[PDB]
Amino acid sequence: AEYQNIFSQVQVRGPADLGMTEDVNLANRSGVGPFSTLLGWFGNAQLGPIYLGSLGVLSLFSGLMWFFTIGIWFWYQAGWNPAVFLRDLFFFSLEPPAPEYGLSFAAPLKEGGLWLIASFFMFVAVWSWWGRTYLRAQALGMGKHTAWAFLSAIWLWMVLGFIRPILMGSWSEAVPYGIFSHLDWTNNFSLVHGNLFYNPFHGLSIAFLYGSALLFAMHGATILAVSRFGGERELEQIADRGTAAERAALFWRWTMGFNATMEGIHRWAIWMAVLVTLTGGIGILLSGTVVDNWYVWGQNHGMAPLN
Amino acid sequence: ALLSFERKYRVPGGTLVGGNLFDFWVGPFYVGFFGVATFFFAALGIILIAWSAVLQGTWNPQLISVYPPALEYGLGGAPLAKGGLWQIITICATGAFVSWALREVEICRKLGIGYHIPFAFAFAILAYLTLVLFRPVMMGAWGYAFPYGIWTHLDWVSNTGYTYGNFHYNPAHMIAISFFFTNALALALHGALVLSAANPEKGKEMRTPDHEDTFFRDLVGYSIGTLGIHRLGLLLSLSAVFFSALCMIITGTIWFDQWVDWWQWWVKLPWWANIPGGING
Amino acid sequence: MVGVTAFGNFDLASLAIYSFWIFLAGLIYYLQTENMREGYPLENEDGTPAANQGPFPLPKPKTFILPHGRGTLTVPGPESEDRPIALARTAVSEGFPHAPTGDPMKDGVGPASWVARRDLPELDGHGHNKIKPMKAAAGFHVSAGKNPIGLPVRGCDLEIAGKVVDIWVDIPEQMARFLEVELKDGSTRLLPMQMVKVQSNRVHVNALSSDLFAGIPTIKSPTEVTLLEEDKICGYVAGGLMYAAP
Amino acid sequence: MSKFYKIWMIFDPRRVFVAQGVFLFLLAVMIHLILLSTPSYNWLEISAAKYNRVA
Amino acid sequence: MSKFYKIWMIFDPRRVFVAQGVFLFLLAVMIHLILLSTPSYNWLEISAAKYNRVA
Amino acid sequence: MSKFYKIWMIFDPRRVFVAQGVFLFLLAVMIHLILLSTPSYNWLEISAAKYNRVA
Amino acid sequence: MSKFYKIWMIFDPRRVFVAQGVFLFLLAVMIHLILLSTPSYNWLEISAAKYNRVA
Amino acid sequence: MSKFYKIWMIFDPRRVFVAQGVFLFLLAVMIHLILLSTPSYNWLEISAAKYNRVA
Amino acid sequence: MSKFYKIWMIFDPRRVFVAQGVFLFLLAVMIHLILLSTPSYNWLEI
Amino acid sequence: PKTNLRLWVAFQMMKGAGWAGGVFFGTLLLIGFFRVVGLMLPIQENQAPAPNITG
Amino acid sequence: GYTGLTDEQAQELHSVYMSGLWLFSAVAIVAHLAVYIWRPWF
Amino acid sequence: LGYTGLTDEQAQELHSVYMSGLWLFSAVAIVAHLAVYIWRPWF
Amino acid sequence: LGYTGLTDEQAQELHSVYMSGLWLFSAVAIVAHLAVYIWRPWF
Amino acid sequence: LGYTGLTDEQAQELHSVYMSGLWLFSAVAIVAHLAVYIWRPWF
Ligand SMILES: CCCCCCCCCCCCCC(=O)OC[C@H](COP(=O)(O)OCC(O)COP(=O)(O)OC[C@@H](COC(=O)CCCCCCCCCCCCC)OC(=O)CCCCCCCCCCCCC)OC(=O)CCCCCCCCCCCCC
Ligand code: BCL
Ligand code: BCL
Ligand SMILES: CC[C@H]1c2cc3[nH]c4c(c3C)C(=O)[C@H](C(=O)OC)c4c3nc(cc4[nH]c(cc(n2)[C@@H]1C)c(C(C)=O)c4C)[C@@H](C)[C@@H]3CCC(=O)OC/C=C(\C)CCC[C@H](C)CCC[C@H](C)CCCC(C)C
Ligand SMILES: CC[C@H]1c2cc3[nH]c4c(c3C)C(=O)[C@H](C(=O)OC)c4c3nc(cc4[nH]c(cc(n2)[C@@H]1C)c(C(C)=O)c4C)[C@@H](C)[C@@H]3CCC(=O)OC/C=C(\C)CCC[C@H](C)CCC[C@H](C)CCCC(C)C
Ligand SMILES: COC(C)(C)C/C=C/C(C)=C/C=C/C(C)=C/C=C/C(C)=C/C=C/C=C(C)/C=C/C=C(\C)CC/C=C(\C)CCC=C(C)C
Ligand SMILES: COC(C)(C)C/C=C/C(C)=C/C=C/C(C)=C/C=C/C(C)=C/C=C/C=C(C)/C=C/C=C(\C)CC/C=C(\C)CCC=C(C)C
Ligand SMILES: COC(C)(C)C/C=C/C(C)=C/C=C/C(C)=C/C=C/C(C)=C/C=C/C=C(C)/C=C/C=C(\C)CC/C=C(\C)CCC=C(C)C
Ligand SMILES: COC(C)(C)C/C=C/C(C)=C/C=C/C(C)=C/C=C/C(C)=C/C=C/C=C(C)/C=C/C=C(\C)CC/C=C(\C)CCC=C(C)C
Ligand SMILES: COC(C)(C)C/C=C/C(C)=C/C=C/C(C)=C/C=C/C(C)=C/C=C/C=C(C)/C=C/C=C(\C)CC/C=C(\C)CCC=C(C)C
Ligand SMILES: COC(C)(C)C/C=C/C(C)=C/C=C/C(C)=C/C=C/C(C)=C/C=C\C=C(C)\C=C\C=C(/C)CC/C=C(\C)CCC=C(C)C
Ligand SMILES: CCCCCCCCCCCCO[C@@H]1O[C@H](CO)[C@@H](O[C@H]2O[C@H](CO)[C@@H](O)[C@H](O)[C@H]2O)[C@H](O)[C@H]1O
Ligand SMILES: [Fe+3]
């Protein structure tokens, strides 16, 4: 076959790129990292620099304490045994307080007090990382699109760990930290709420999740198909439409009767992905607070046959 | 009616079949030999779904459900009201999907672009054929396929899943989920980054791709680059679908038990199976 | 709140799902109108405005302030091709192909099409030329893969068109953009890196026979390439997939 | 009524005639399917009952 | 009231007439479907019972 | 009250009129659907009971 | 009626004849499948009973 | 109070009035839905009980 | 009927004949499959 | 001349039939592969329950 | 006038169109009459 | 002027037509409410 | 006059052949309906 | 009138060939239908 542009044929390397300055405090940038020739086949080879200001210190140290708190709980569950630790790794779980403790903070350490401590470190880590996404954009003079998109993911995460437990009135509703246990929580949640497939916002959230795979398959394939015309230089195509953007638009126009622009396809992109967790968080927040049996709700809303 | 730049591209040729016979547009839509085919199969399948609703006795589009033949038919043809309509609609769907892909190929040829788009769509078709064709014929009955109905195909997903316990424990399904979640992450970041560069703070100049690299390096210490992110978004999407098809074609064909029991192979590796304590000891 | 309805079956979950449909309709209207900033208004095939323009009205104009004093782009705004198009109607009715009146490769029509972009180079974030010959790029070298420099270039007729004499590189993104090929007559041409296949003993070009390489558009200065020249070169090379002789 | 011909100065007949054709076919199809879904008006079932074609 | 013709200087008649045509059809379809969903107003069921056409 | 015409210097009448037409239709549709959902105000069921039209 | 030939001043016969060929074959195939799915008119099923070909 | 008019030198009136309109409508709808959801304040059920309109 | 030959001045016969070969083959296959799926006419189970 | 023309028409129709056959037969070969593989696997012993209420 | 039809062309086209509408609706009236006599829906 | 480019006279003219439409629409709505209230009081 | 470039005489000529095809097709269809109605009356 | 580049005489000749083979194809089909009907009447 002809060249498909999925992996580069020739790598070139020059002086390391320290990045744009703008209003960035350059003292808070690291040096440049190594160049990975393995990554250079698919994307850029250069690693780093990374920016590490005040919110980054807060986020990383809080995130480290979250990860370390779970880790030491797993080593305790392993009985300090390195062979057992690796054998049972996916089976260990730091579990929320039992239902009889409600929202209180009185639960013992083994009985969910450690889960509260870890969750506090997680809360600080994630929210300080949100402010990091906002301020990194600010210092470069960029739009805040990344921080606002990330707020949709935080919305689902907040619903799962914080808002729905408070509305339900116990921490026991929250997700356990553990590989198989959070899967088991996911299955149990649907069984308790009478089949989550009949939650219409879960259905929408799936539609947007599939739509994200559809749209990125389309967009990624499109840009590679026009990459022979410089199509992946999307900002310059936005500033000065070339034949790459015109051929991309006409392919979809002739295929399905309408098309995007080089800017506006990224507006479809951001919203398609955002809507996954926006609708997701609504669907979960409604579950148990408003609808405790989604199949029966579906029967009463014309989407499942009556008994 | 044309886009203001469109006329210079609407030239003859690039067709796979039919020459000039179908080489024309109906408004924006290019036709071609496979456009004729696609429309016929799509219209026929749609009208047969509506006719199946007449037989079912419902006009609520959420309750319309075309079921495949019962297991007692095996791989034979069924009575039309008892699953033969599902068989014809499945042939129409397959005809429409394949015709649509082949029509995209001749659109690619006329525009001189690469074939990545119809190639990418073929993964979605093969996933569909996994669930309606390859897995049912391995399992020996059409009745293992899913029904064509908005909520009833979710009943098939639920019933198929719980046949093997919690379906989360399917290892290929775990991989497929990870690609799906990673793809949606990458799409959000990619959309946001291009928009944040094209639409800066008020009254600032457009940001360059160098600012796009800089933002991600500052944020996570790495930037995959403008070419790399489109390669990534394609391969994440296609890998998600490939591992989806794999997770199903093995299910009920080489694996039959509760998927949670599979993971015991790791726990019962002989160098640690008997060590006391932990969760599994 | 479970089972609490305002009327009938109208639950707080019902309020949510109906609110989402109204939001989604508004969002889709926004998304489609934002995607109408290029290519509209719609035209008849004679170039006059079409009687039908579709259900979505055009968005208000927006202005991009371009970097490096390249000015402003306001969109939507007056579209024009600003070049000759050598296509004639095959039919009096709409919807049929327009046939090339000359050589479509030379005329730059069909899959050989190019757009009248700015006749200036693309600039990096600091205002230097984004794409440079690697002999002019101070620290750049081939770091992995077969170095193409010095390989013969074989056309799809399986005959040699020339030899590779340099790589042109994207400086900020550190990637190979073009191969510079010296032809039989001693002039050079740029071949897009996406349209060549590098092999252990040759560079193979599926899109062009060896006789077409002389017709690749030349760059007006040997050290830089304009966005206009890029569109002309890339358009012509891809055009060979349809129009190169068997 | 006399001036209704001026619709053709606003809408191009090539589009309108296609839109009308699609509209009238789908409308006609939907009414026939509605009657076939209605036991009192499914002519194929009425005639089966009339001519005793069921058992 | 006499000034209402000035709306055609605000809005393009092509979009208005397409929008109105779609709107009126969907409104009419909605009202007929509501009545067919109503046992006291489904004229096909009413005529079925009147003429003893069921069973 | 008198000065309210200056709103058309703030808002483009085109945008307002489209938004208001959508708003008023969806409001009206919602209120009729509420009353149809309400047994004491569903006029089709009230007339059915009044004229003894069911069974 | 006498002026209906002017339709060929509005549509090119190439596009029309393709659209008609798709339409007529679609319509015929659909009606045959409607009858094959109907016990009273499925000729293959009627013949099997008439000549006692089953079992 | 007399200087509160200077808010329009800080806040763009187009953005304010749109945000105000959306705010006030959603607040109004929310309160009416709360009262309809509250059996002691559902004015339709209250009048139904008052006038013996059901059963 | 005598003017039906003018179809070959509207549609290119070479392309029509190829497409007609596809149509007639697929139509025949459809009808044979309908008869194989019919217990009274499946000539492979007799 | 005419025998050459007759053979040419036949050849063009045989090209279409040959491709439609080849695709159809290739489809059946792919189906047969998955059938053969499914006959070799332990499926017959471990047959799954019906996922659909149709059974 | 957006379409480029003259007023005379719009008149001519409408007259033929209306003869189409009347023919189609007259056939429909006869179809409704037949079905109504066969099986009244009121 | 304002943001829309309507002059003061154009704004007064458009408002006068708009308000007559509003009064017409609301007059019909008042009669509808009166008819329904007399038929079936909701208080 | 036309969008298609057919003359009036050509549009008449083409319509005369088209209507011959339509009447031929509808005639055989009437025969097919008559045969089926005799074999198995609907209504 | 002509979109294909066949002359009128070329189209007449080619149609006479196509029709002759169409009749032969229908004749073979009639024989196959008659054989099947004698074997196993579908009416
Ligand atoms: C906080 C956790 C919760 C969940 C929260 C989840 C939020 C997810 C938001 C994702 C937004 C992605 C799109 C985007 O462009 O983002 C960047 C954008 C601009 O960046 P910038 O730096 O400030 O500016 C750059 C400048 O150059 C301009 O750039 P640009 O032109 O691209 O920006 C304009 C975009 C941005 O607009 C928005 O983002 C609006 C977001 C609205 C979210 C509402 C979702 C929930 C309600 C629905 C639930 C429905 C189900 C219940 O313009 C647009 O994208 C326009 C979109 C139009 C949609 C129209 C819909 C109309 C529907 C009504 C029709 C009525 C007809 C009668 O940022 C913003 O403008 C600010 C975004 C603020 C987000 C919401 C924050 C939380 C609000 C609620 C709490 C506070 C208020 C009470
Ligand atoms: C993939 C693995 C499973 C499966 C599991 C699920 C689950 C789980 C969910 C869905 C959901 C959906 N599925 Mg399903 N579904 C499968 C196979 C299919 C196929 C198919 C031909 O193979 C189709 C068309 C659909 C269609 C759909 C939609 C009704 C809905 C939203 C999808 C979406 O937005 O996707 C991405 C695509 C887009 C965003 C583009 C727009 C797509 C539109 C909306 C599709 C409309 C389909 C239409 C109603 C079907 C009839 C076609 C007409 C006759 C022409 N499913 C198989 C069996 N599907 C969700 C839902 O809400 O169900 C009620 C849901 O919860
Ligand atoms: C038996 C199981 C149940 C079920 C129960 C649930 C439950 C329960 C939930 C879902 C949810 C989801 N389901 Mg469901 N679901 C089922 C069947 C399906 C099927 C299918 C084919 O059958 C599909 C495709 C889906 C699809 C989906 C998604 C659309 C959705 C999750 C979106 C997302 O990205 O979440 C993943 C993303 C997040 C949770 C956001 C995370 C953001 C935070 C900030 C990240 C922090 C990272 C941390 C700091 C660590 C970083 C370390 C790094 C090293 C740096 N479901 C069945 C019916 N499903 C969710 C939902 O929204 O429902 C409406 C949900 O809660
Ligand atoms: C719109 C919905 C989608 C979404 C969007 C999204 N996510 C986002 C963003 C966006 C737009 C961001 O901007 C943000 C980001 O930065 O992306 C690069 C983010 C992000 N999405 C993330 C994850 C994620 N997103 C997910 C999903 C989704 N993201 C949705 C599909 C998922 C899942 C389950 O589906 C996950 C897991 C992160 C990569 C990032 C947010 C990072 C964050 O908040 O981190 C806090 C924690 C830390 C900084 C560190 C934790 C501890 C680590 C172990 C580091 C320890 C360091 C130490 C020095 C070493 C210690 C060693 C010793 C222990 C031995
Ligand atoms: C492989 C990666 C992802 C992917 C990729 C992808 N899809 C694609 C493409 C690509 C690259 C296209 O080029 C193509 C396209 O044109 O997109 C606009 C397409 C497309 N992906 C589509 C949908 C889609 N893709 C999906 C998935 C994915 N597509 C993957 C996740 C899904 C789901 C459920 O996950 C859906 C719904 C369409 C928008 C489009 C293909 C359009 C097409 O085939 O058109 C011709 C056919 C018709 C117009 C209708 C046929 C109707 C049938 C005859 C009857 C219906 C039968 C059906 C089985 C009924 C099912 C009922 C449901 C309730 C289950
Ligand atoms: C759940 O809660 C429930 C629903 C139960 C209860 C709550 C209900 C609520 C919250 C209701 C809220 C209702 C509101 C806010 C209603 C508002 C109504 C308004 C403002 C209506 C206005 C109508 C105006 C009309 C119809 C105007 C028409 C105008 C014209 C016809 C003329 C247009 C102008 C022209 C042509 C002039 C053009 C000028 C030039 C120079 C060209
Ligand atoms: C759910 O509710 C149900 C469905 C149950 C019930 C409700 C049904 C509803 C709401 C139905 C609504 C039906 C409507 C709105 C029907 C409208 C029908 C119309 C308007 C039909 C018009 C037909 C017109 C025809 C067939 C015209 C044909 C014209 C021609 C053949 C000639 C065209 C002109 C020519 C050739 C002249 C060209 C001239 C020159 C100079 C070139
Ligand atoms: C979970 O815990 C719960 C929630 C249960 C209990 C805890 C509650 C907590 C933590 C509550 C915290 C409450 C706080 C921090 C409240 C703070 C309230 C404040 C600071 C309110 C301030 C209000 C100020 C107002 C309304 C000012 C209005 C000003 C104006 C209208 C005029 C603005 C100035 C103008 C227009 C002049 C402009 C001048 C020029 C020259 C342009
Ligand atoms: C929904 O439930 C069901 C389906 C059961 C009930 C509903 C059924 C409905 C709604 C059915 C609707 C049926 C319709 C709309 C039928 C319309 C049929 C028509 C219009 C058929 C027309 C056929 C025309 C033919 C076959 C014409 C053939 C013409 C030729 C062979 C000659 C063409 C001219 C040539 C070759 C030369 C011209 C060139 C020159 C140079 C003179
Ligand atoms: C679901 O509904 C079912 C399928 C059950 C029932 C419905 C079926 C339907 C809707 C069927 C529709 C069928 C149609 C429209 C069929 C159309 C068939 C046609 C027009 C076939 C025409 C074929 C013409 C041919 C093969 C002509 C060939 C001519 C030549 C090759 C010229 C060369 C000379 C020859 C063959 C003579 C050779 C002999 C000697 C001695 C030299
Ligand atoms: C090698 O050994 C060492 C120890 C060195 C390192 C090993 C580390 C290991 C093995 C770590 C394992 C980590 C795992 C398996 C983590 C799994 C995490 C998963 C799967 C999480 C899934 C979902 C979590 C959610 C949804 C959590 C949401 C939490 C919030 C929204 C936080 C809300 C805040 C709360 C509840 C705090 C309230 C309390 C106060 C005081 C404010
Ligand atoms: C991509 C499309 C996927 C869907 C494709 C569907 C294609 C279906 C083709 C069916 C082909 C004919 O299939 C044929 O069916 C009949 C009828 O059930 C089977 O017949 C079987 O059941 C009947 C009764 O129901 C018995 O009398 C018979 O002895 C038994 O074999 C045949 O064994 C099989 O050969
Ligand atoms: Fe992109």
mmCIF file of C-alpha atoms in Angstrom, chain F residues 1-2 4-13 16-17 20 24 39-41 43 46, chain L residues 1-8 11-12 14-16 18 25 36 39-43:
data_model
loop_
_atom_site.group_PDB
_atom_site.id
_atom_site.type_symbol
_atom_site.label_atom_id
_atom_site.label_comp_id
_atom_site.label_asym_id
_atom_site.label_seq_id
_atom_site.Cartn_x
_atom_site.Cartn_y
_atom_site.Cartn_z
ATOM 1 C CA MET F 1 -43.354 52.729 30.798
ATOM 2 C CA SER F 2 -43.062 55.115 27.831
ATOM 3 C CA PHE F 4 -39.488 50.776 26.818
ATOM 4 C CA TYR F 5 -39.070 51.094 23.011
ATOM 5 C CA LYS F 6 -35.331 51.608 23.651
ATOM 6 C CA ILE F 7 -35.062 47.827 24.244
ATOM 7 C CA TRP F 8 -34.904 47.485 20.428
ATOM 8 C CA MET F 9 -31.688 49.531 20.549
ATOM 9 C CA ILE F 10 -30.234 46.910 22.928
ATOM 10 C CA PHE F 11 -31.609 43.679 21.371
ATOM 11 C CA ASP F 12 -31.840 42.848 17.666
ATOM 12 C CA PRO F 13 -35.597 42.359 17.021
ATOM 13 C CA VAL F 16 -35.961 38.488 20.181
ATOM 14 C CA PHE F 17 -38.862 37.540 17.898
ATOM 15 C CA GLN F 20 -40.180 34.725 21.910
ATOM 16 C CA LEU F 24 -44.557 31.129 23.804
ATOM 17 C CA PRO F 39 -58.112 14.267 35.089
ATOM 18 C CA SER F 40 -60.307 17.151 36.317
ATOM 19 C CA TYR F 41 -59.288 19.297 33.304
ATOM 20 C CA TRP F 43 -61.539 18.231 28.189
ATOM 21 C CA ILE F 46 -64.743 15.417 30.584
ATOM 22 C CA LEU L 1 -27.373 55.015 19.400
ATOM 23 C CA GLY L 2 -27.460 51.496 20.840
ATOM 24 C CA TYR L 3 -25.844 48.231 19.785
ATOM 25 C CA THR L 4 -28.436 47.225 17.153
ATOM 26 C CA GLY L 5 -28.133 50.266 14.868
ATOM 27 C CA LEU L 6 -31.866 50.967 14.959
ATOM 28 C CA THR L 7 -32.450 54.707 15.161
ATOM 29 C CA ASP L 8 -34.691 56.146 17.871
ATOM 30 C CA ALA L 11 -37.151 51.766 17.588
ATOM 31 C CA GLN L 12 -40.335 53.726 18.376
ATOM 32 C CA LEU L 14 -41.059 48.809 15.719
ATOM 33 C CA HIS L 15 -42.182 49.000 19.368
ATOM 34 C CA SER L 16 -45.556 50.450 18.350
ATOM 35 C CA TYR L 18 -44.874 44.961 18.533
ATOM 36 C CA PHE L 25 -52.479 38.297 21.580
ATOM 37 C CA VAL L 36 -62.597 28.572 30.632
ATOM 38 C CA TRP L 39 -66.967 26.925 32.198
ATOM 39 C CA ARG L 40 -64.765 25.447 34.942
ATOM 40 C CA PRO L 41 -63.350 27.632 37.766
ATOM 41 C CA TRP L 42 -59.843 26.686 38.898
ATOM 42 C CA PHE L 43 -60.375 28.532 42.204
#
